[PDB]
User: Fold this.
Amino acid sequence: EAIVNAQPKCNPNLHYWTTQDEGAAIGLAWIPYFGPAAEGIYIEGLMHNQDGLICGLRQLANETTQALQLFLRATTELRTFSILNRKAIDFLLQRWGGTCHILGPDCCIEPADWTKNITDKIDQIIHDFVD
Amino acid sequence: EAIVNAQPKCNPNLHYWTTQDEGAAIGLAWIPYFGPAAEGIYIEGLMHNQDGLICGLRQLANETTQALQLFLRATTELRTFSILNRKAIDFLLQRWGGTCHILGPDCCIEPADWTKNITDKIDQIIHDFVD
Amino acid sequence: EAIVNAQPKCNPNLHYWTTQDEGAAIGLAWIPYFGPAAEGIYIEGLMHNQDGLICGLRQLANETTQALQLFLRATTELRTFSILNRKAIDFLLQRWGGTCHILGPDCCIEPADWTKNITDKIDQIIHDFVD
Amino acid sequence: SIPLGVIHNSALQVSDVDKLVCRDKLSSTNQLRSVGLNLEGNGVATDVPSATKRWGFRSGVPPKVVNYEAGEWAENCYNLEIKKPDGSECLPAAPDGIRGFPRCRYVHKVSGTGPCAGDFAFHKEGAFFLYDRLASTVIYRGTTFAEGVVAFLILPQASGYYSTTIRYQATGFGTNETEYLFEVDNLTYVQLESRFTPQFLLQLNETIYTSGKRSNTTGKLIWKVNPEIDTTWAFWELSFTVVXXXXXXX
Amino acid sequence: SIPLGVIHNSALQVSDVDKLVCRDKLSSTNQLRSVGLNLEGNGVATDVPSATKRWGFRSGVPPKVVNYEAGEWAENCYNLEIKKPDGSECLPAAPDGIRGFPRCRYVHKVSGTGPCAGDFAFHKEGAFFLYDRLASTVIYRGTTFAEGVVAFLILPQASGYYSTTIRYQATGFGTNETEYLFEVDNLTYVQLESRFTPQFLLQLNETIYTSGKRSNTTGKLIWKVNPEIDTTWAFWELSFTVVXXXXXXX
Amino acid sequence: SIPLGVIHNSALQVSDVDKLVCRDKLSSTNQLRSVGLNLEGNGVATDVPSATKRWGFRSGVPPKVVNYEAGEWAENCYNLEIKKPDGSECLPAAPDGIRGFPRCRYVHKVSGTGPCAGDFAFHKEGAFFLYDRLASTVIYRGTTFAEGVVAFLILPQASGYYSTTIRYQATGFGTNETEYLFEVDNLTYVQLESRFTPQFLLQLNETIYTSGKRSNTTGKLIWKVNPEIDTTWAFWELSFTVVXXXXXXX
Ligand SMILES: *[C@@H]1O[C@H](CO)[C@@H](O[C@@H]2O[C@H](CO)[C@@H](O[C@@H]3O[C@H](CO[C@H]4O[C@H](CO)[C@@H](O)[C@H](O)[C@@H]4O)[C@@H](O)[C@H](O)[C@@H]3O)[C@H](O)[C@H]2NC(C)=O)[C@H](O)[C@H]1NC(C)=O
Ligand SMILES: *[C@@H]1O[C@H](CO)[C@@H](O[C@@H]2O[C@H](CO)[C@@H](O[C@@H]3O[C@H](CO[C@H]4O[C@H](CO)[C@@H](O)[C@H](O)[C@@H]4O)[C@@H](O)[C@H](O)[C@@H]3O)[C@H](O)[C@H]2NC(C)=O)[C@H](O)[C@H]1NC(C)=O
Ligand SMILES: *[C@@H]1O[C@H](CO)[C@@H](O[C@@H]2O[C@H](CO)[C@@H](O[C@@H]3O[C@H](CO[C@H]4O[C@H](CO)[C@@H](O)[C@H](O)[C@@H]4O)[C@@H](O)[C@H](O)[C@@H]3O)[C@H](O)[C@H]2NC(C)=O)[C@H](O)[C@H]1NC(C)=O
Ligand SMILES: CC(C)COC[C@@H](CN(Cc1ccccc1)c1ccccc1)N1CCCC1
Ligand SMILES: CC(C)COC[C@@H](CN(Cc1ccccc1)c1ccccc1)N1CCCC1
Ligand SMILES: CC(C)COC[C@@H](CN(Cc1ccccc1)c1ccccc1)N1CCCC1
Ligand SMILES: *[C@@H]1O[C@H](CO)[C@@H](O)[C@H](O)[C@H]1NC(C)=O
Ligand SMILES: *[C@@H]1O[C@H](CO)[C@@H](O)[C@H](O)[C@H]1NC(C)=O
Ligand SMILES: *[C@@H]1O[C@H](CO)[C@@H](O)[C@H](O)[C@H]1NC(C)=O
Ligand SMILES: *[C@@H]1O[C@H](CO)[C@@H](O)[C@H](O)[C@H]1NC(C)=O
Ligand SMILES: *[C@@H]1O[C@H](CO)[C@@H](O)[C@H](O)[C@H]1NC(C)=O
Ligand SMILES: *[C@@H]1O[C@H](CO)[C@@H](O)[C@H](O)[C@H]1NC(C)=O
Ligand SMILES: *[C@@H]1O[C@H](CO)[C@@H](O)[C@H](O)[C@H]1NC(C)=O
Ligand SMILES: *[C@@H]1O[C@H](CO)[C@@H](O)[C@H](O)[C@H]1NC(C)=O
Ligand SMILES: *[C@@H]1O[C@H](CO)[C@@H](O)[C@H](O)[C@H]1NC(C)=O
Ligand SMILES: *[C@@H]1O[C@H](CO)[C@@H](O)[C@H](O)[C@H]1NC(C)=O
Ligand SMILES: *[C@@H]1O[C@H](CO)[C@@H](O)[C@H](O)[C@H]1NC(C)=O
Ligand SMILES: *[C@@H]1O[C@H](CO)[C@@H](O)[C@H](O)[C@H]1NC(C)=O
Assistant:
């Protein structure tokens, strides 16, 4: 599906915050005893609406809510951390969960370079045929 | 292994309950503030013993218990939610955890349609050979 | 990278403890009511420094600490159990997260046995050519 | 290895960890399911005297919880409020997010006392206590559960609800000499026997109310049924005279 | 199915669960992201009177928490200390590990009372309360949050921070007739109207301090702004006379 | 990226995230392991005076826990019961499900007081406190731990246990001027020095009992060993006169 922003307004710029899971630490700052407190672990960035991505993202988060709320209603887990890992698993199962039939629409195997090896070795058998 | 129901009795019918992770919600019922309480999130169904599946399932759950209890004894996690995701990962690793040797018993790649492409292009080289 | 033990000393022997997730239980010992208490679930073993693995492992755990601490700083999960499952997912995504171009350096598909089938069926077409 | 159920040749089987079947297909985690099955469906005795003997107290073993996605409607569930004779609780409060089993035709609510010689109450046969989509190895206080076990499945590619609470009082809970009383009201009781079904208890309760055989003093009236009276095989297939006031029904 | 955002043809799209695109590449879990977007950025009214009407109390629904990795700097956040008239708390304490939203230009801290006819406070439009990288369906006591929603993305292969607290008192919180007062000091207040912006409240607070218009008794001084005075469209784009001492600003 | 250990060319290596090795095989999650290694095995000083200087208190940093599946038998573990001079606890109770390290030849149990100028006690060198298959960044009260670090491995395809508790009293815990006393009984103590090994303390304790050198009043008897006496390099490779009653051993 396509994303149709149907919101009263859109802030076209995204002033965002996040963490860093392997920031190149200076000296001993990676040690919890010496490192920053909870308030000082964030990095910031600013992103503009190139390709309409910011206004599309605001609509995407809005449209995601019904499915996410229904998922949360049905889980017994108090805090859910596994959504992204499960989507990665489903990504793999969609492609590799069964037998990969080469040249099929659901098998992501490209034999082209090895077509240009098998067809490129016919002139080692049909060329070499002197008698 | 096969499943041998060795229970004193078997209820051959399964009157079951479960949830729904993306039920087609009516209006605003997906909103937690407006939606059903904890007691009203369940759907029901009835399944009969076709192919002996119900009596096999009762025996399967019984036989699963020793392994599940030993798994739970060895984990430090207070509540385990990851068993099914890990089985999906192990499903993929069993097939794709190493190099896939085509035509091997452990490589689930079917080249048949592309055998019927390479062998079906010999009569573009051996047919076209007029001089 | 290689592992360079740069510690003041190295205990070359590893007297280790661990659990067992499916130990062949005797009788009813798998039942929590009858089985061992928390202190009696461990097995022990002793491993020596063959191939320098023990001293390398001590250095590996030491060097792992900065990255692990930075990961833990950035997670909101109180107890992290998912590191190994995520590494298994990343193992699969590195190999199968895109189209597998046969004979490419990043595609772990071995067609050799099926090269020795296609090239081994040329003498069913070039041999059988009598007229 | 935890067994995984799979359907081959029109029959359920345990998938073999050693042999790889390439024509088996898992295209989504939705095909994987965890399910809870009630011991009821295997033919075990569900009366309170028989059911409670399958549970016991034990220290030194940390409790463990595992989730399951779907379960079976239960005829019999149980809900325990057991204290020691000194008044202290025998069972821990239900942890955050653990609710009662969601489908119970009869909830056997047992209140009373026992020695409770252990930190947690376990299932002596290794089964689980099934709650709302969480299976625990131990019993939580005042929380409705069904006895059951869990299976894991890989599936192929794609009357309302009535519940009735039956109240009991107990002494010596969890021992050889446990005594049980069915509760008609706060002063009228019936001596419990293992052969009494839920339907018999509810009908016996109704006749006691409509025959006016409740206690009409401030004292405790304990009726006893004599062996002559029968009771009504698995679930899916009178004269009152008075002799603490004991009495007889025949 | 939970939607997943993906970039195709220079545009963001929802990935279709049915159709498989082999040229899409996911070489690492690092390409997957969960992000929180503030309702602010969609143009909703952020004043306390308008914002609080989007929340309501409800029993019977267990709270749920989901994590998100990155968020948006917020202009308006909220922090609630609501009690019932009898003094009991309306909101639960923040669970272990749930901290306030990390980037808030203005924290609207509301203290006061209301009936609070429900166990938890939910968002009436189904949005989430965004905390520090955890999104909850409910409001926690004294914990700063932004209203927002969560999206999930699969990405292609690879001024400081100032915050100002604005304090309010409230009566009848969560009802039709909720009254709000902006707090200048513990004895000087301004009758709140929905049209007042954060910048106007802070400037009105500064003039009251420098014009000496605070309470100089032990009693409560409540100023009122008359409609004549304007106030200063989304965030990204005087004479005092006295008439509990009420008064007027014109 | 968290390093992953792999065996190549008969040697342990860190797997390179950038380069893909197709002949590496991961056929099961069982090949992946998390393991805890004790700082002991790297040659650090394990005496209580040296060990405690590696830990310090700090506020503002939330504690974090990570699990590990297998560990190393420890010679030295530690168990802390530290209060402030006003009697309040310096360390938090062990969270649900966190038990002591399971293999400790000597458990150094330290009770006493200190300023404890911080909410949690961390490891100053960034190591972890190893508990029962859970590694924490902080110290829990009265819970036995070993200092250690965690490694992650991808493996190729497929005397009993004695523990002795050594008790200490401490003042000024966590500072420059921390004083330690080895506990013979509740009234007899030995001034602690960093050079004393566990075996020396247990033998010194035994001679004090069999030479009858305990306190035989109601007062506190504190022995001191003079430098003359030696003590018995890593773990894997007398006349008493009295001068609060202080005294000397030579
Ligand atoms: C999975 O299904 C299995 C088959 O239904 C279950 O097996 C049950 O296992 C328990 C042990 O945990 C047995 O209990 C034992 O019973 C013996 C005998 O009890 C009396 O009954 C026989 C006649 O049946 C009688 O001849 C004897 O003299 C006894 O008077 C006791 O001596 C033991 O102490 C212990 O209580 C069950 O009997 C057994 N059931 C069956 C039908 O074999 C198994 O429990 C199931 N697993 C789970 C997790 O539920
Ligand atoms: C995702 O984005 C959607 C579009 O912005 C959001 O839609 C909002 O949905 C809520 C319902 O949950 C609506 O609230 C209702 O509003 C009506 C009308 O209110 C008054 O306003 C109109 C003019 O706008 C006026 O003509 C009417 O007479 C009313 O006086 C109320 O009657 C209802 O009771 C209810 O309050 C929003 O109006 C609606 N917004 C828009 C712009 O359509 C949706 O909430 C977003 N999802 C999340 C999770 O945030
Ligand atoms: C992984 O292994 C590394 C190597 O064993 C560990 O390195 C240790 O890192 C800490 C810092 O966190 C160092 O502690 C510092 O030591 C200096 C010097 O202390 C005194 O010692 C030298 C002689 O050794 C002497 O010449 C000096 O004058 C000092 O009197 C202090 O000044 C600092 O304040 C700080 O305490 C260790 O010294 C260092 N050890 C080694 C052997 O290099 C590292 O900690 C390990 N990682 C983990 C997580 O355990
Ligand atoms: C082995 C056979 C029983 C095949 O399962 C057959 C059935 C699975 N459900 C029902 C179910 C539904 C959603 C999620 C999980 C389970 C089931 C319910 C309770 C206990 C056991 C199973 N399917 C599903 C419905 C109809 C078919
Ligand atoms: C769909 C587009 C928005 C593409 O995301 C573009 C951006 C993602 N971040 C920023 C970010 C960074 C690390 C982890 C998660 C998120 C974002 C932050 C907050 C809300 C939404 C997104 N990338 C990343 C940085 C620069 C590019
Ligand atoms: C890199 C080498 C050390 C190879 O690990 C060699 C050993 C792994 N165990 C032991 C072990 C066993 C089960 C699960 C996890 C770990 C180990 C134990 C404690 C610390 C470190 C490792 N195997 C396993 C046994 C015998 C072989
Ligand atoms: C319980 O009673 C049985 C006999 O029914 C007896 O064998 C057993 O010893 C008793 N238990 C105790 C603890 O006395
Ligand atoms: C019966 O006793 C219970 C428990 O003490 C009490 O809660 C209930 O109100 C009583 N009912 C009547 C009718 O007295
Ligand atoms: C017993 O009978 C009375 C009278 O109808 C009824 O009110 C009561 O609910 C019954 N008890 C049970 C447990 O059904
Ligand atoms: C009064 O009590 C007797 C027993 O004490 C009981 O059997 C009778 O039903 C009661 N009342 C009536 C019949 O009105
Ligand atoms: C709140 O006020 C509205 C009118 O503004 C009215 O319709 C409604 O009934 C009131 N609510 C209550 C609970 O009285
Ligand atoms: C104002 O009142 C609050 C709440 O009672 C109190 O904490 C604060 O100290 C008071 N400030 C002054 C200046 O009196
Ligand atoms: C109001 O003005 C006074 C005077 O400068 C200042 O101290 C106070 O912080 C202001 N209040 C707010 C909420 O900014
Ligand atoms: C004294 O109080 C009045 C109102 O009661 C106020 O307007 C005035 O600013 C106060 N003090 C001054 C002007 O010094
Ligand atoms: C602790 O003692 C050292 C000297 O051994 C001194 O430099 C330091 O200032 C002292 N710390 C405090 C807090 O006084
Ligand atoms: C020694 O003191 C401890 C702590 O007060 C106490 O628990 C223990 O019983 C005492 N032992 C003796 C023998 O007095
Ligand atoms: C010290 O010696 C006495 C006498 O044998 C013994 O009872 C006690 O356990 C010893 N203390 C320790 C810590 O071993
Ligand atoms: C009595 O106390 C002294 C020191 O006060 C001690 O050295 C001696 O061992 C004690 N008792 C004996 C020797 O019986």
Observations:
- DSSP finds three helices and five strands in chain A.
